[PDB]
């Protein structure tokens, strides 16, 4: 009842989840459960909106396949779903980010990513522009350029 | 959550655990059978080699088109895959090697042709516009040589009349039940070192040594294709043991997680139900 | 179940405190006081008896509900019935795996006790190894014959409505299937094979039946094997 | 006697000591007994008859060859079946398939040898099945 | 407690379930859980009882396979089970029916089907006489003759 | 709450298994599922703990290979496993014991076996001193000396 009734009083919600935290995905933000009233073409622009919903469409299909993936892995998936899962896992890791306040814990220096860079980075991932790069390159970085740079020493 | 939803899932995962566990044993039985069949195919092939090497040892200026290399205008490619799935990356790994080899080696589709032994490979090659000349599907789990004889004879015949000038075969080589390695092995032309090194013996030939040799050389090439099939089958069933062994271990992990969620909901439901009854009674008094 | 709910009604109306599913603290005491009066008296007390068959109607198979839990623990055993078996055609729909009789062999004659040992062994192995059933003719001959035996014993354990069998006719039917005299006959003909076999035994070979009635033991096994084999030649499969 | 093995790529079909092994070679009918000269010859698709005294055994053999030594007699073939292990209905349907196709085909054809050899395999399987 | 207690007061029960209604199977009658006191050879005859029981065994086997098929796939079953799945889905659709009072919901005329006609229809499906008709042919029709006519439109 | 509160006070568990009773292994105590808090080098000696854990590891390995043995066969097992399987079967029979109370059932007189004799007996089996003796010798006896004494009679 307490968090349930709180939802009515909010324009934006950041829904943290233990499963993401235990995976090392920080901040542990659920990308589908987290919502905002100002996620629309009028406020954030057409490209921002299209990329945002494109990311959520990939992650939604990845979420639907979890029961199958848990048992059988990725071997029995179709060629289309194999690509969706591969892009989803990279998206999931590029959504993580090192924090200035979390320097004491992790050891990595924090990063501030502008909106234009965030929209550009996830757009390029959706377009298959970084399919060649390994997964850990997307994990705990700022811009998409830092993911390209991290992939070299890996 | 909702108990009805969780208990439905527990029934689903428990049944799925039983079948995956059962298919591991079914695959493992067929692994043994494929290896036992290979123990009969090996001396069968060695016997044919013995007679071929004996003929060549007692013939002046010995030569045959199947043993001689020549310039390669075209190349034949036999590719072994399974029909059924649930064999881990078995089919994915061997098809990756074929894709890498063809892209690096060839610049056009006219330079080669494909014999698709197995449904999974056939579908892969046809979907991406590869030149599939012939195919075979519905091969039994413990196969006989007769089940691949037509496509083998067709592939051997295409080398003999110079439709192509080389024939190799792609399959997963069996190392162990866990480990299977994609490889490419040459069939035609036959290497003179490995075919003519059998034990030499004095035989009479009827009608003659040339007539016997003309039967046995294509027959030896058939057994090389058959031995690759049996070894690929061993790799298939071993890969299915591992994949369904993992699926069984994953099912037991999930079944525990669901059992924790169920008993969390069961205890919560009884706690809530009894609390509402007692709250309702206290309101009167 | 309906008796318990009726006592709950009165207790709640008399304002006695409610507990799990609104039942009072003496609803267990209610059923235990009832069922313990059923008993087997000693020789000194006349040797008479009262056998009890209490019913419980579960809801969606919830045997861990409160009133079921009470009556399960009170009694000497449980005959669990199930909907899945009923809809499949296994009737009576008795789940043999979870059903219990703590009295056990003591409540049986010597003939039934001897034949039933193999029956419970064969039926346990069948439903345990039922995952291999769809994989026809890929299996080794050890598990092949056990599946063939198992599905035939299921057909004998099927039984029509309002047609109770005498114990002497039951033991011969169980003896026939467990020793392998129905392995030759097809699966669909097992129930017809049973009915005609017992008709043959009642008419012609009554001395073997009467031995079980009088002594409570099996007759000469090789004589019984000979009697069944005479019928088996006269039978026409389909 | 002489030890005889009839074998395929997948299994051993016959094993035992025989008085004589009657096999139909491409040039003529061989009668292989003990102390025969070392010989190799292709066989026609036909029954291989093994006499062990009073007992005769026919094995339906197709696409095979004989290998004789004074010590040992080997027959390696594509298919080899004793009477009891032949699928009779499969052979009849195979016979009817290949013979009706063969009737509308000349010798100058791609698929003539494939059907004719498959027809011979079917008919020999039926001959050995009828002996039981 | 309310519907559970009501069961004691009935000679026949039509058990509606949402999962059938969610597919579009109307009337959404549970073919196993629905029961009647007069479902026996003495009342309805030996053929009626055998066909009715045959329908229930096919549909029971389909439910046992649904959870197995969902993860492990369709082609891993035997030829007997594949035929059972095919007939079960056709039987389930032939159990559906357009009602006279529900023309505004179905968008087609309602149908009355006699008992002897109903028994004949499901008998022919069990025997395998309509295995080549598609699934939609059996959906929302009266007699088995109407299913043969509907398959020509598809 | 009922078993959880009870388990807070328990120091051990004696888990009886029906499959052992069907084999004739009495007392039918499950040697892997039964546990004790005082099975350690502190309470019992270093030797007791070493032997007890060795018995568990041998019996656990034998239990894991049951599916492999049943289908593939004994030739599938390595030379290390064949010896472990042989010792496990001897160990499983030496864990059985004739009871003073169960003289009517077994026929033989009952046996009290001290801890030191129990530790010594299973130690000698693990070391391989009694590998050449038959398996019936270890069944239904007290000390290891009684097993050796039974071997001459077989």
């Amino acid at each position: 009842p307490a968090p349930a009734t709180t939802f009515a009083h909010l324009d934006a919600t950041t829904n943290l989840e233990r499963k993401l935290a235990e995976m090392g995905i920080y901040p542990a933000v659920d990308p589908l459960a987290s919502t905002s009233r100002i996620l629309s073409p009028a406020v954030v622009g057409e490209e921002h909106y299209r990329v945002a919903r494109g990311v959520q469409q990939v992650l939604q299909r990845y979420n639907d396949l979890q029961d199958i993936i848990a048992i059988l892995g990725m071997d029995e998936l179709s060629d289309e779903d194999k690509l969706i899962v591969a892009r989803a896992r990279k998206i999931q890791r590029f959504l993580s980010q090192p924090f200035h306040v979390a320097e004491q814990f992790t050891g990595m220096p924090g990063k501030y990513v502008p909106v234009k860079e965030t929209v550009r980075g996830f757009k390029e991932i959706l377009e298959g522009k970084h399919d060649n790069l390994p997964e850990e390159a997307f994990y705990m970085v700022g811009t998409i350029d830092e993911a390209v740079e991290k992939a070299k020493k890996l | 959550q909702g108990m009805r939803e969780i208990k439905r899932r527990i029934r689903s995962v428990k049944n799925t655990r039983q079948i995956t566990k059962a298919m591991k044993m079914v695959a493992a039985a067929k692994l043994r059978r494929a290896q036992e069949t290979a123990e009969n195919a090996r001396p069968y092939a060695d016997k044919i080699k013995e007679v071929i090497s004996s003929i060549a040892a007692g013939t002046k200026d010995f030569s045959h088109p199947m043993l001689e290399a020549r310039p390669v205008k075209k190349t034949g490619y036999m590719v072994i895959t399974s029909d059924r799935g649930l064999a881990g990356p078995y089919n994915a790994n061997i098809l990756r090697l074929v894709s890498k080899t063809i892209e690096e080696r060839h610049q056009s589709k006219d330079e080669y042709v494909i014999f698709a032994v197995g449904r999974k490979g056939r579908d892969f090659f046809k979907k991406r516009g590869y030149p599939v000349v012939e195919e075979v599907t519905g091969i039994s789990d413990t196969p006989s040589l007769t089940e691949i004889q037509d496509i083998a004879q067709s592939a051997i015949g295409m080398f003999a009349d110079e439709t192509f000038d080389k024939l190799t075969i792609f399959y997963n080589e069996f190392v162990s039940p866990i480990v299977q390695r994609p490889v490419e092995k040459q069939l035609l032309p036959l290497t003179s070192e490995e075919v003519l090194d059998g034990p030499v013996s004095a035989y009479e030939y009827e009608p003659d040594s040339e007539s016997v040799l003309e039967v046995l050389l294509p027959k030896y090439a058939e057994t090389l294709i058959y031995s690759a099939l049996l070894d690929a089958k061993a790799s298939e069933f071993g890969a299915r043991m591992t994949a369904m062994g993992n699926a069984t271990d994953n099912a037991t992990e999930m079944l525990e997680t669901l059992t924790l969620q169920f008993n969390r909901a069961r205890q919560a439901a009884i706690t809530q139900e009894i609390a509402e009854i007692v709250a309702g009674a206290n309101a009167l008094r | 179940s309906k008796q318990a709910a009726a006592y709950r009604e009165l207790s709640l109306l008399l304002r006695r405190p409610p507990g799990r599913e609104a039942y009072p603290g003496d609803v267990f005491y209610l059923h235990s006081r009832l069922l313990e009066r059923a008993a087997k008296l000693s020789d000194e007390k006349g040797g008479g008896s009262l056998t009890a068959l209490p019913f419980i109607e579960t809801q969606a198979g919830d045997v861990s509900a409160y009133i079921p839990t009470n009556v399960i623990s009170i009694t000497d055993g449980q005959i669990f019935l199930e909907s899945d078996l009923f809809y499949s055609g296994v009737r009576p729909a008795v789940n043999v795996g979870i059903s219990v009789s703590r009295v056990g062999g003591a409540a049986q004659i010597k003939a039934m006790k001897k034949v039933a040992g193999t029956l419970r062994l064969d039926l346990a192995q069948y439903r345990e190894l039922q995952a291999f059933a769809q994989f026809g003719s890929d299996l080794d001959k050890a598990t092949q014959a056990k599946l063939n035996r198992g599905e035939r014993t299921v057909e004998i354990l099927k039984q029509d409505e309002h047609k109770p069998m005498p114990v002497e006719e039951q033991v011969i039917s169980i003896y026939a299937v467990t020793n392998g005299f129905m392995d030759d006959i097809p699966v669909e003909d097992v129930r017809r094979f049973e009915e005609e076999l017992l008709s043959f035994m009642r008419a012609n070979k009554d001395s073997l039946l009467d031995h079980i009635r009088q002594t409570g033991e099996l007759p000469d096994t090789k004589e019984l094997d000979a009697a069944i084999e005479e019928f088996k030649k006269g039978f026409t499969p389909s | 006697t002489v030890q005889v093995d009839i074998v395929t790529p997948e299994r051993k079909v016959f094993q035992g000591e025989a008085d004589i092994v009657i096999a139909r070679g491409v040039e003529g009918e061989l009668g292989v007994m003990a102390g025969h000269i070392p010989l190799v010859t292709p066989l026609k698709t036909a029954p291989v008859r093994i006499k062990q005294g009073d007992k005769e055994t026919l094995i339906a053999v197709s696409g095979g060859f004989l290998e004789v030594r004074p010590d040992k007699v080997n027959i390696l073939a594509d298919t080899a079946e004793l009477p009891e292990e032949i699928a009779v209905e499969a052979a009849k349907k195979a016979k009817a398939r290949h013979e009706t196709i063969l009737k509308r085909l000349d010798k100058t054809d791609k698929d003539y040898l494939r059907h004719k050899r498959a027809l011979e395999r079917a008919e020999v399987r039926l001959q050995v099945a009828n002996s039981k």
Side-chain angles (χ1 to χ4, degrees), chain A, chain B, chain C, chain D:
Chain A
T5 314
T6 314
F7 280 113
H9 309 276
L10 303 169
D11 298 303
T13 62
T14 311
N15 300 34
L16 301 173
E17 202 70 57
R18 188 177 303 285
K19 196 164 280 161
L20 293 169
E22 293 181 353
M23 284 169 65
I25 305 303
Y26 285 109
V29 181
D30 192 328
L32 301 169
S34 301
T35 56
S36 177
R37 205 187 83 264
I38 62 155
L39 182 72
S40 63
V43 183
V44 302
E46 191 65 50
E47 193 184 36
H48 192 124
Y49 185 77
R50 188 183 56 75
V51 170
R53 297 304 192 191
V55 162
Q56 291 178 327
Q57 193 180 344
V58 169
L59 294 162
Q60 181 58 59
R61 181 53 177 176
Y62 182 54
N63 190 71
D64 292 341
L65 296 163
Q66 292 296 121
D67 290 351
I68 294 159
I69 292 159
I71 302 295
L72 302 169
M74 292 156 285
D75 296 305
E76 308 309 302
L77 299 172
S78 61
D79 293 327
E80 288 77 41
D81 284 337
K82 283 189 196 188
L83 184 59
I84 290 162
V85 170
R87 300 236 181 95
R89 292 162 61 77
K90 292 169 184 185
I91 285 160
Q92 193 170 37
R93 286 159 177 75
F94 197 59
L95 286 164
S96 74
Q97 187 174 338
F99 275 20
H100 302 285
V101 172
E103 284 188 54
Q104 293 178 342
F105 314 129
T106 55
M108 303 166 205
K111 287 281 154 67
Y112 186 100
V113 188
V115 173
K116 275 199 165 71
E117 294 294 340
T118 311
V119 172
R120 189 174 76 79
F122 285 99
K123 181 180 170 179
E124 289 172 18
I125 293 162
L126 285 165
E127 292 170 346
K129 198 166 193 170
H130 308 279
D131 288 336
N132 64 324
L133 304 185
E135 295 189 334
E136 195 172 40
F138 299 98
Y139 181 65
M140 290 288 194
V141 290
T143 57
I144 199 75
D145 294 314
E146 294 175 40
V148 170
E149 289 295 314
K150 186 175 173 180
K152 296 174 199 187
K153 292 135 283 180
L154 201 73
Chain B
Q1 56 255 306
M3 275 192 291
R4 285 185 165 284
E5 200 167 45
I6 300 170
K7 200 66 163 181
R8 154 173 131 72
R9 286 216 70 192
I10 291 160
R11 195 194 177 186
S12 175
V13 174
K14 181 157 183 170
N15 292 354
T16 306
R17 185 190 58 182
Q18 290 281 295
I19 302 300
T20 53
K21 179 56 175 167
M23 286 178 68
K24 188 183 179 186
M25 295 302 98
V26 169
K30 293 168 174 169
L31 168 55
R32 182 187 43 74
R33 288 196 70 182
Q35 291 182 124
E36 285 172 1
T37 313
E39 288 164 24
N40 287 259
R42 202 175 300 101
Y44 188 96
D46 290 334
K47 180 53 61 173
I48 296 160
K49 189 200 289 186
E50 193 191 336
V51 176
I52 291 161
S53 65
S54 293
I55 291 157
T59 306
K60 279 306 314 297
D61 304 319
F62 179 74
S63 183
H64 203 255
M66 292 195 179
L67 292 156
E68 288 184 305
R70 54 173 192 272
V72 184
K73 289 199 286 281
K74 289 181 72 167
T75 309
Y77 290 128
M78 302 198 74
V79 185
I80 304 172
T81 55
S82 64
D83 289 339
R84 298 149 49 202
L86 297 167
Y90 174 83
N91 296 309
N93 292 341
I94 192 60
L95 295 165
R96 194 182 303 110
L97 181 60
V98 172
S99 300
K100 261 67 178 179
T101 308
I102 290 167
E103 195 171 38
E104 295 164 26
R105 191 179 292 170
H106 300 287
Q107 294 294 327
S108 184
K109 296 176 185 178
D110 294 13
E111 299 176 53
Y112 65 96
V113 288
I114 289 159
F115 301 88
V117 181
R119 201 190 304 283
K120 230 77 185 177
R122 170 178 77 75
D123 296 343
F124 179 90
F125 292 128
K126 288 180 171 189
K127 187 176 170 182
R128 291 158 187 76
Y130 284 85
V132 184
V133 174
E134 280 173 36
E135 67 194 56
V136 63
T137 56
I139 299 294
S140 74
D141 289 316
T142 312
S144 304
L145 186 139
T146 50
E147 296 178 57
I148 57 87
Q149 195 172 22
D150 291 339
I151 196 162
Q153 283 180 351
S154 190
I156 292 156
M158 282 175 186
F159 180 87
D161 72 346
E162 311 186 56
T163 311
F164 48 74
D165 307 293
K166 188 176 185 173
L167 186 71
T168 72
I169 187 156
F170 288 91
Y171 62 98
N172 284 293
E173 188 166 49
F174 182 84
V175 183
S176 73
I178 289 82
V179 189
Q180 304 88 25
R181 287 160 189 170
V183 289
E184 192 190 358
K185 300 293 188 183
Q186 189 170 316
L187 292 166
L188 301 170
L190 294 162
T191 55
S192 297
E193 312 314 317
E194 299 173 309
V195 175
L196 307 178
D197 70 325
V200 180
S201 294
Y203 302 104
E204 190 172 40
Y205 301 101
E206 188 171 294
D208 50 75
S209 58
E210 267 203 293
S211 298
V212 174
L213 184 70
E214 207 65 43
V215 175
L216 295 173
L217 277 167
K219 192 182 281 281
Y220 185 76
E222 285 173 32
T223 57
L224 292 171
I225 295 161
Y226 179 58
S227 299
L229 184 70
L230 292 178
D231 199 51
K233 285 283 176 191
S235 292
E236 186 195 330
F237 302 128
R240 187 162 296 106
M241 283 174 73
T242 310
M244 303 306 267
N246 296 339
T248 303
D249 295 344
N250 293 332
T252 53
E253 185 179 295
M254 190 187 291
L255 193 65
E256 193 175 35
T257 304
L258 294 163
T259 303
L260 183 66
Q261 288 173 17
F262 180 77
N263 291 323
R264 186 185 182 77
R266 188 189 65 77
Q267 290 180 34
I270 296 165
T271 304
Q272 193 189 336
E273 283 160 20
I274 199 173
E276 291 172 350
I277 294 159
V278 172
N282 295 339
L284 297 166
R285 293 185 163 284
Chain C
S1 306
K2 294 175 189 77
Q3 191 232 351
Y7 187 70
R8 182 177 65 186
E9 179 179 325
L10 298 167
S11 306
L12 292 168
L13 289 162
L14 295 161
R15 302 207 165 184
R16 298 188 185 178
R20 187 176 174 187
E21 300 172 35
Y23 289 96
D26 66 332
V27 77
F28 182 93
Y29 180 45
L30 188 78
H31 287 150
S32 65
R33 194 174 68 247
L34 173 63
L35 291 163
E36 209 76 79
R37 292 160 65 170
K40 168 55 176 172
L41 298 172
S42 61
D43 295 354
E44 291 168 37
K45 302 294 188 194
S49 67
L50 176 59
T51 313
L53 295 176
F55 279 39
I56 283 290
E57 178 156 293
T58 52
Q59 296 297 321
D62 188 15
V63 300
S64 301
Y66 186 50
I67 303 298
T69 305
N70 292 353
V71 180
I72 287 160
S73 65
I74 291 157
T75 50
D76 305 310
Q78 302 84 45
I79 299 163
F80 288 99
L81 306 182
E82 269 158 22
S83 309
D84 287 320
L85 296 167
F86 184 84
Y87 303 141
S88 300
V90 176
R91 299 188 180 182
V94 182
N95 188 354
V96 176
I98 67 169
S99 293
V100 192
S101 178
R102 296 159 78 78
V103 176
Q108 295 176 310
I109 70 183
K110 295 290 181 76
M112 182 61 79
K113 198 198 300 189
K114 198 163 188 174
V115 302
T118 316
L119 184 62
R120 210 176 217 286
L121 190 72
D122 288 20
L123 195 70
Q125 284 157 214
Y126 173 72
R127 295 182 182 178
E128 190 174 51
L129 303 169
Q130 201 166 19
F132 296 96
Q134 70 181 338
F135 299 96
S137 80
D138 298 315
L139 309 172
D140 64 320
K141 288 198 170 188
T143 55
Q144 193 74 20
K146 289 179 168 179
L147 289 162
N148 291 20
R149 178 63 63 76
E151 71 188 341
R152 287 172 164 76
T153 53
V154 167
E155 294 293 310
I156 298 295
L157 296 163
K158 289 181 187 185
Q159 193 170 339
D160 291 335
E161 197 184 16
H162 310 316
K163 290 187 181 169
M165 190 173 283
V167 68
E168 66 271 29
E169 295 185 51
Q170 293 184 33
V171 296
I172 294 158
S173 186
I174 296 159
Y175 181 87
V177 72
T178 52
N179 288 291
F181 292 86
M182 313 198 192
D183 298 335
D184 189 43
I185 279 71
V187 179
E188 69 189 315
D189 297 312
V190 174
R191 295 195 70 183
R192 191 169 57 76
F193 185 84
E194 184 179 13
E195 194 179 324
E196 289 176 18
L197 174 55
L198 299 172
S199 296
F200 175 88
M201 289 290 289
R202 280 195 307 283
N204 303 8
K205 299 287 197 293
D206 191 54
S207 57
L208 295 165
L209 282 160
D210 194 53
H211 186 85
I212 298 156
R213 295 196 201 96
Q214 293 288 310
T215 64
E217 301 187 48
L218 287 165
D220 189 52
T221 52
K222 291 171 180 172
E223 193 188 324
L224 181 56
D225 289 8
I228 297 158
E229 211 78 57
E230 286 176 6
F231 171 78
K232 194 169 169 189
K233 294 170 185 178
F235 186 76
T236 54
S238 57
Chain D
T1 65
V2 65
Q3 197 77 47
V4 190
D5 283 354
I6 292 165
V7 172
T8 72
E10 51 271 344
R11 71 204 177 79
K12 297 195 178 185
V13 183
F14 188 88
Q15 285 186 309
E17 291 196 304
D19 293 309
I20 184 163
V21 180
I22 309 297
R24 196 184 302 165
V26 289
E27 304 304 314
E29 179 165 286
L30 277 294
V32 179
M33 296 181 64
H36 193 280
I37 305 110
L39 172 63
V40 178
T41 180
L43 299 175
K44 295 178 180 180
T45 296
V48 178
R49 173 152 37 80
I50 304 173
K51 284 171 183 163
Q52 291 174 311
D54 191 42
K55 190 180 179 180
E56 270 186 26
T57 311
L58 301 180
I59 305 90
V61 176
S62 78
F65 72 99
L66 181 64
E67 192 225 14
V68 187
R69 274 87 68 82
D71 189 48
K72 183 68 181 300
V73 177
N74 291 321
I75 289 167
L76 281 68
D78 294 350
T79 54
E81 298 96 10
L82 299 159
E84 66 261 32
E85 70 198 347
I86 291 162
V88 174
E89 293 297 304
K92 289 180 180 174
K93 288 160 185 166
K95 185 194 162 173
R97 179 201 169 184
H98 295 307
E99 79 191 345
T100 57
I101 295 165
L102 198 76
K103 282 162 181 175
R104 59 163 174 77
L105 289 171
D106 293 310
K107 294 146 187 171
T108 306
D109 194 286
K110 184 183 171 67
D111 302 303
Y112 183 80
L113 296 170
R114 199 169 103 270
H115 295 317
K116 193 174 181 182
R117 286 182 285 186
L119 176 56
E120 285 170 11
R121 185 186 294 179
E123 290 184 318
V124 168
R125 279 171 173 175
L126 294 159
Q127 285 175 39
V128 176
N130 292 141
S131 66
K132 189 189 173 186

